[PDB]
Amino acid sequence: AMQMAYRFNGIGVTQNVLYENQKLIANQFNSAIGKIQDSLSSTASALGKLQDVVNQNAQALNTLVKQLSSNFGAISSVLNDILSRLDPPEAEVQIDRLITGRLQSLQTYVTQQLIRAAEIRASANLAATKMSECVLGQSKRVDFCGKGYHLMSFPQSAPHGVVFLHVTYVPAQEKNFTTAPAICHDGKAHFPREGVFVSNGTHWFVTQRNFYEPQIITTDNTFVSGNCDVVIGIVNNTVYDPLQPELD
Amino acid sequence: LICAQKFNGLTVLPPLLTDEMIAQYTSALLAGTITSGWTFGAGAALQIPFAMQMAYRFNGIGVTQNVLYENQKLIANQFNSAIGKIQDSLSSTASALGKLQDVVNQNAQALNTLVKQLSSNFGAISSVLNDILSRLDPPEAEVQIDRLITGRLQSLQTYVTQQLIRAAEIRASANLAATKMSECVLGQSKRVDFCGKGYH
Amino acid sequence: CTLKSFTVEKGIYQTSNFRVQPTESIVRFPNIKSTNLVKNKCVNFNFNGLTGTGVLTESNKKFLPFQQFGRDIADTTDAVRDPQTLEILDITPCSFGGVSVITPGTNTSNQVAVLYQDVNCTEVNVFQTRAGCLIGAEHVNNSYECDIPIGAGICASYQTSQSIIAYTMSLGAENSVAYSNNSIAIPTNFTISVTTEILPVSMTKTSVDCTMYICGDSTECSNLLLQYGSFCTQLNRALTGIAVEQDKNTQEVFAQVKQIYKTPPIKDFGGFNFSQILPDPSKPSKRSFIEDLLFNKVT
Amino acid sequence: SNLLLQYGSFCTQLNRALTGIAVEQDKNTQEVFAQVKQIYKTPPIKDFGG
């Protein structure tokens, strides 16, 4: 639980939203893993990449091994036939034609294999990077380790490949508020330390940028800078100044 | 030169996404990044006044936000002047779009070489199949036609190999561009000197 | 017949090409047998030995009084002078087009649509596109998500009492955020989401022998092949390079921990249920559940 | 066309390979300009703080 709190705290969402929503997050995570279970083991086969490798290798091998049955100009397609059917001083030219043909075919096969191997090398390096950054730590490259704010990841093996389950965070039902970038309380503008100002219509609050949780504007969530005569859109208001009640 | 190239079975398929769709895509990305900042790349779209998003982005690089809200007009003027400088710099120098010109040039050059390859003897007595047929008999014309076939086949092989290599390189560049689109546009980056030059 | 199968899956495939055919064979001889001239037809021609086929049209380019042929950047005869009537013609070759076929899959229906890649199809339901023309599909005015790409922004689908439809694809739902200089939108609830991402790591480490493939277990074939000495030694070197590269790939992607951590036998993980991804000792091997699910769907 | 049947499996190679490349091209664009489920329009007001 504390590690999940540490991982929330890395996307600008304070911990108190986790420790107070533990059951709900557990339930959502379990339901999601069940959905991914049901989505894999179904007729909706989504493993196209891992299958393309096998299919392309099989097709290349089949074409190469079928190339053995072409005359290329010679009088046969099997060496033993020409060997038992002709004398060497004549069989030389036919065997030579067959040799050039099969050698050209082998050359093309090797070249195609080299290129596809380079492509797979590129993909494997990308996979290594993703495994090192998404799994062994939380990432902040947007849309690299999932879709949304990334929380964690779990790898799973697969034939001739790897499969990442990215567990990511995505916000939900929102609300419209009226904002303002400053509060001229007493001639001095008060900017927010970390959050953003909102107004439910009459009052004002400061809240974190990713989860509506309205606090009260004090001299502890804000900081003063300059006079309230230069910021463009600023609204007069009051600040709590928490020392006055207890000190008096 | 388009149809002349086309006149030997060498056709050019049209792209799937016509230019209007790409324009709509880029306009969508712009509108999203200037009316919602980055949240439109991580779920729904949440609007936010542009000045406040810019203050978020300053806070991202260490500079507290009281710097922006006290220099808004100056920063807007610098931004506008910079955009104007960009527009002017494009409309005057020709060597700006070097890369995108290099691709077109190399593709057209490969195609022209492939076409001009169809006019050499390769050891035969001519480069016109109708000619060799109408001037010789099968038992002695088959060797000529074999020479020509081998030569043209070899040229085609070289062309396909060149295309494969170039396509691999452009695929690498397109993956790089996709990463830049995902990490620079849809959100502020911090990989130093990745998404520009300086703090981003 | 082309795919070498009895079941075809949903998509676009390519059969043989298409070629317009010569409707007439004209010839031109000097005044010393000659035949009549024809225009605007996909025809053969002959000009004093000069042989070819195309669309003999009237030229607009002013020759010089001694010029017969005409050419271009690609050096293709596209103008000739008439040795009978002293006329300079145009030429535009005619054999053009690939033939493809759209099919929703031979598990759903035996209906198909044909597509000619660059033809106005005044040749051979008909619907013209920007990417050739499309026979057998019916055009609509809606806009859906793309299912089978045609080109130039045209996508074809099967759903409709069914028929093949071909429409202009749509990018998505078009909305407008109510942006206002003092308006903001703040979330109130969240949602975890577990997505997947697939990555190929290594292909099958193959290997070929030079002489056992080019030759059989022959003798004079090897003694002939020894005239191309250093070819297939190089080939085998390249292939072993690829093999060791695959091995290194797997090593690098997975071998990133020096220890082998065992999870404790308890599962007091704050409330989460990892039972579907941690290994199961009851299994014969040591694979987990989703590992097996993946391992079965690759055949 | 008859003498070319002495090599035939070559050509069904080439086309195939080329088509691969062709398809991949569209895929490329689908990765770059396709990351927004929606299509946004900026409002007709141009009050962007300056």
Side-chain angles (χ1 to χ4, degrees), chain A residues 4 21-22 24-26 28-30 32-33 36-37 40-42 44-47 49-51 53 57 64 67-68 79 83 92 95-96 99-100 102-103 105-107 109-110 113-114 117 120-121 123-128 130-132 136 144 146 151 154 156-179 196 198 207-212, chain C residues 4 178 180-228 231-232 234-236 238-239 241-242 245-246 248-250 252-254 256-257 268-274 276-278 287-299:
Chain A
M4 196 59 60
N21 298 58
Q22 198 154 356
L24 163 68
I25 299 173
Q28 295 196 10
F29 178 34
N30 297 336
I33 202 67
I36 200 62
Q37 183 177 266
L40 273 188
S41 68
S42 88
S45 315
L47 285 184
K49 302 192 170 60
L50 297 189
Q51 202 74 18
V53 159
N57 288 333
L64 157 69
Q67 281 277 111
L68 276 174
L79 285 191
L83 285 187
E92 294 287 13
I95 300 177
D96 212 293
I99 282 185
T100 75
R102 294 168 169 183
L103 181 50
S105 195
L106 187 45
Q107 286 296 149
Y109 167 58
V110 169
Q113 273 309 98
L114 272 180
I120 294 297
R121 170 68 166 168
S123 160
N125 280 121
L126 160 66
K130 289 172 70 70
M131 162 91 61
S132 67
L136 308 201
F144 182 60
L151 282 190
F154 314 119
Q156 306 286 169
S157 45
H160 299 150
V162 73
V163 166
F164 290 80
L165 317 182
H166 301 162
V167 164
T168 77
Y169 179 81
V170 162
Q173 52 206 36
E174 48 263 25
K175 291 169 48 62
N176 292 327
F177 301 83
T178 68
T179 181
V196 60
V198 293
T207 188
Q208 59 191 357
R209 303 160 161 116
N210 275 333
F211 194 67
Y212 185 55
Chain C
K4 304 286 227 313
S180 314
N181 52 339
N182 68 338
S183 177
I184 208 176
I186 285 283
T188 54
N189 222 0
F190 50 87
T191 289
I192 324 292
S193 68
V194 186
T195 75
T196 75
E197 172 158 34
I198 316 300
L199 297 158
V201 168
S202 45
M203 63 175 183
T204 71
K205 321 199 312 186
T206 176
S207 158
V208 177
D209 173 283
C210 165
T211 313
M212 195 41 183
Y213 169 74
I214 278 180
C215 306
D217 62 5
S218 157
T219 58
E220 40 273 25
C221 183
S222 89
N223 306 150
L224 273 181
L225 170 62
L226 285 184
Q227 310 311 98
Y228 314 147
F231 265 102
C232 54
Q234 177 183 5
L235 301 179
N236 302 332
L239 284 185
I242 276 177
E245 187 76 4
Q246 305 304 281
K248 164 68 161 312
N249 286 338
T250 291
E252 167 183 4
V253 178
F254 283 101
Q256 299 211 333
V257 280
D268 186 9
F269 288 146
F272 300 180
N273 204 285
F274 289 93
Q276 305 302 315
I277 54 174
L278 290 179
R287 303 196 285 210
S288 46
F289 195 87
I290 306 175
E291 277 161 339
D292 276 359
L293 301 200
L294 284 177
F295 196 80
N296 277 346
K297 290 177 52 56
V298 172
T299 57

Side-chain angles (χ1 to χ4, degrees), chain C residues 159-186:
Chain C
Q159 189 45 55
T160 311
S161 87
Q162 312 287 72
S163 158
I164 296 300
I165 52 181
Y167 54 99
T168 296
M169 46 186 307
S170 46
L171 314 175
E174 171 170 23
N175 71 350
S176 279
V177 291
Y179 163 74
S180 314
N181 52 339
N182 68 338
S183 177
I184 208 176
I186 285 283

Side-chain angles (χ1 to χ4, degrees), chain C residues 34-54:
Chain C
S34 177
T35 75
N36 173 34
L37 168 62
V38 63
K39 316 186 186 197
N40 296 267
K41 284 161 46 189
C42 180
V43 299
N44 185 82
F45 56 79
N46 185 208
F47 282 89
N48 317 116
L50 162 58
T51 52
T53 45

